[PDB]
Symmetry: D2
């Protein structure tokens, strides 16, 4: 129900080995760790959560772009890219969070489908 | 060897039923029709060409964004999005041309892999 | 030393009257208010800080995209757009943070000049 | 009535000295030269046309991205970036075409104002 896709706008490739941390806003308004992983050789990260676990809430998907660029050699502008959204508030949906990375820029989109 | 992926930044969905026309620059410097198709329900268009057919050259992938937006109801800025690139000049590669559409904007990227 | 520019990809216009909040990361890892404002008719927000106050550190620029879309009667995906970066003195002097907004997507870049 | 703004997503800067060629679609469906120039130090190109000359029609703005990247010693994907649009009098008066460049990608938007 939650997938992340990351592309590299410099290389024209998937962004591989990108760390991703997901948080969910708690009752007390803190950001609780929810899940985490790394993108694959295809720039994809699946298996973050289950439909049972992925309840309604406000989620933050933090993509560790700095760590990606620095592992490359390369000094980027942003600390990370954070994507924050309400999920599942009209029932369960499947979410793909995509990001396209450059050293001083990124774009992000969502694909939301109703299974 | 040539795939096209189109997303809709307004709806948060694949861009379905988008017409795509591919041209290849000829010896005489004209743009010859090469292939064409429509995106699927997943916003993807496969089956445009074969490795045999997809020789070295300068290719133009014209994504008919205006027709997409107008079929929607909706009056957009651009006539189309054109993606022009040299392909296969270091031997065969697989190319994915992606576009993310809004009424007054688009972004495009390439994913190039060596099979 | 710090400017924000916001554009609207649906209407082909500056994004006007967008709330923007800037925070600086404190020693205890919390985010403290730094500057805020609303974008102008040109989608710009100037006058956020001065050279004196804008010291090296980690800053967050939070753009209230949800309220922007809702005011236009459009349903959006994101709660906000967040741009988090380090200001570094050995780089050029002026930072412009730009964002290009759509309901389910945004783009952001930095223009850092001398 | 027509301005072009080009930014560099790798270096976080204006894209300076980029060649830009503007064409207008002729009655016979060919593209005829209209205006050209090179972006300034601020990544801008002004002075392309006048209100008198910039009549309704289909225009193409071709940004020579390949030469830009090659001059920086970087290998790029695209031959150029093409932006094709109709100018319509019943819309706002001034058109700004912006582009944000990376070696294997670009973004473009229009800001159309009165
Ligand atoms: C879900 O997204 C995908 C899934 C599979 C394959 C894909 O491309 C090969 C994509 C592309 C995503 C994408 C994201 C952003 Br942001 C921009 N700007 C662009 Br252009 C494209
Ligand atoms: C008219 O545009 C401008 C005028 C003055 C200053 C500007 O930034 C400092 C801009 C930004 C343009 C812009 C274009 C794209 Br395409 C994307 N993706 C992004 Br983000 C931003």
């Amino acid at each position: 129900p939650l997938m992340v896709k990351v592309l590299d706008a410099v290389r024209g490739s998937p962004a591989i080995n990108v760390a991703v941390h997901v948080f969910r806003k708690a009752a007390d308004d803190t950001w609780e760790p929810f899940a985490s992983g790394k993108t694959s050789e295809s720039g994809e990260l699946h298996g973050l959560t289950t439909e049972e676990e992925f309840v309604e809430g406000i989620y933050k998907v933090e993509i560790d772009t700095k760590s990606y660029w620095k592992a490359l050699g390369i000094s980027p502008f942003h600390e990370h890219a954070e994507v924050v959204f309400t999920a599942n508030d009209s029932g369960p949906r499947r979410y793909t969070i995509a990001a396209l990375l450059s050293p001083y820029s990124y774009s992000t989109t969502a694909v939301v489908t109703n299974p």
